[PDB]
Design a protein around this ligand. Structure first.
Ligand SMILES: [Cl-]
Length: 315
C-alpha cells in the first residue's frame, strides 16, 4: 500500500462523496494539483498521515477525520474557535447533589420551584417514555422548562425523536434530507421531507428554553432544528456545532478510514444546518459570572421564563 495510491484513493473518496464543496473557499481540483506534488512514495506512514490530514483540513470541517491505528486527524478549530459556554463545576451549583436521575436525564426544579431544569448530556444515554412522564409530572406546577443540551455530542436518533415528539401539538414538517446521487459535487437527490408526529404520552406546551453551545452537535443539531420550529420554544446560548448524526465512512487501501457527514440536512426553508444553527438569543458565560459561581445562560433562561406577561390562562 503505497503513499501515492492512498493519496489518490482519499482524494477520490472526498471528490465523489463529500457533500459541502459549494460552501468551501477551496477548489478540490487545485487541492489535487498541490498535494500531487507533495505526496512521494518514499514517505513513511507518519509523513503520509500528516500530509493527508492537512489535505482534509483544506475543507475546514469539524466533522471530517482521517483515522489510522496511531492517530486521528481533525480540524477542531471548528469547535475551539467558540467559547466552552458550559462548565460542569458551575452547573453543580444548580443541580447540587439532590437532583433526580431519569435515564440519561438529570433534572431539578429551580427558582422557588417555578422552573423545571433538565440536563441531557448524551443522546447515547437512553430516555424511556416513563422517564419523560415522571420528569414532566415533577414539573407540573412549573411556569416553564429549561432543556439543556450543551456539550451533547449526539447519539441515537431514537431518543431525539422520542423527546422532541413531547413538545408537538400536531404532526409537522421537521425539514428535509438529500443524499449523494452521483460523483458530481452538487449531484444530490431532491430534498426529501421528514415529518414528526406528537406523542400520545405527557406533552409540554408551556414555554421551553433549549440551551445550546458549539459542543451541541450531530443528533443534537437535528434535535435543536426540530425544537426551534415550535411556538413555545426559545433556543439560547451559542451556535450549535452542526453535523447531521448521519456519517459517511470509507476505508483507504492502507486500512485507514475517512469519515464525514453523509447527507445534507435542510431546515423547513431548505437551508443547510450542517454548519450549525444559531440560537434565538445569543448568551455567553461571562468571566465575572464564573467568579460568582453563576451560569450566565441558565440565569438568562430563568429570567426570560420568569418575565411576567398577562395573568390570563388562554390559547
Ligand atoms: Cl418506557
Amino acid at each position: 500500500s503505497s503513499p501515492r495510491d492512498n493519496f489518490e484513493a482519499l482524494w477520490r473518496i472526498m471528490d465523489e462523496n463529500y457533500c459541502f464543496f459549494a460552501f468551501k473557499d477551496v477548489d478540490w481540483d487545485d487541492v489535487y494539483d498541490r498535494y500531487n506534488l507533495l505526496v512521494k512514495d518514499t514517505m513513511n506512514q507518519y509523513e503520509l498521515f500528516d500530509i493527508l490530514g492537512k489535505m482534509l483540513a483544506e475543507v475546514k470541517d469539524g466533522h471530517t477525520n482521517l483515522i489510522s491505528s496511531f492517530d486521528m486527524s481533525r480540524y477542531w478549530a471548528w469547535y475551539e474557535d467558540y467559547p466552552a459556554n458550559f462548565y460542569k463545576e458551575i452547573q453543580d451549583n444548580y443541580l447540587g447533589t439532590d437532583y433526580k436521575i431519569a435515564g440519561g436525564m438529570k433534572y431539578k426544579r429551580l427558582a422557588d420551584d417555578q422552573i423545571g431544569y433538565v440536563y441531557y448530556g448524551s443522546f447515547s444515554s437512553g430516555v424511556g417514555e416513563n422517564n419523560l412522564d415522571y420528569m414532566f409530572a415533577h414539573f407540573k406546577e412549573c411556569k416553564g422548562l429549561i432543556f439543556d443540551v450543551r456539550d451533547n455530542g449526539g447519539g441515537s436518533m431514537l431518543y431525539s425523536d422520542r423527546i422532541a415528539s413531547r413538545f408537538l401539538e400536531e404532526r409537522i414538517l421537521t425539514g428535509y434530507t438529500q443524499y449523494k446521487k452521483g460523483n458530481g459535487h452538487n449531484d444530490f437527490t431532491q430534498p426529501n421531507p421528514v415529518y414528526l408526529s406528537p406523542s400520545d404520552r405527557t406533552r409540554w406546551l408551556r414555554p421551553v428554553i433549549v440551551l445550546t453551545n458549539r459542543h451541541s452537535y450531530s443528533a443534537t443539531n437535528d434535535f435543536v432544528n426540530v425544537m426551534r420550529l415550535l411556538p413555545q420554544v426559545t433556543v439560547m446560548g451559542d451556535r450549535t456545532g452542526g453535523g447531521s448524526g448521519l456519517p459517511f465512512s470509507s476505508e483507504l487501501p492502507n486500512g485507514w478510514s475517512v469519515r464525514f457527514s453523509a447527507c445534507p440536512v435542510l431546515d423547513v426553508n431548505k437551508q443547510h444546518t450542517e454548519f450549525g444553527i444559531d440560537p434565538d438569543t445569543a448568551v455567553a458565560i461571562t468571566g465575572e459570572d464564573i467568579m460568582k459561581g453563576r451560569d450566565t445562560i441558565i440565569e438568562a433562561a430563568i429570567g426570560l421564563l420568569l418575565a411576567k406577561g398577562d395573568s390570563a390562562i388562554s390559547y
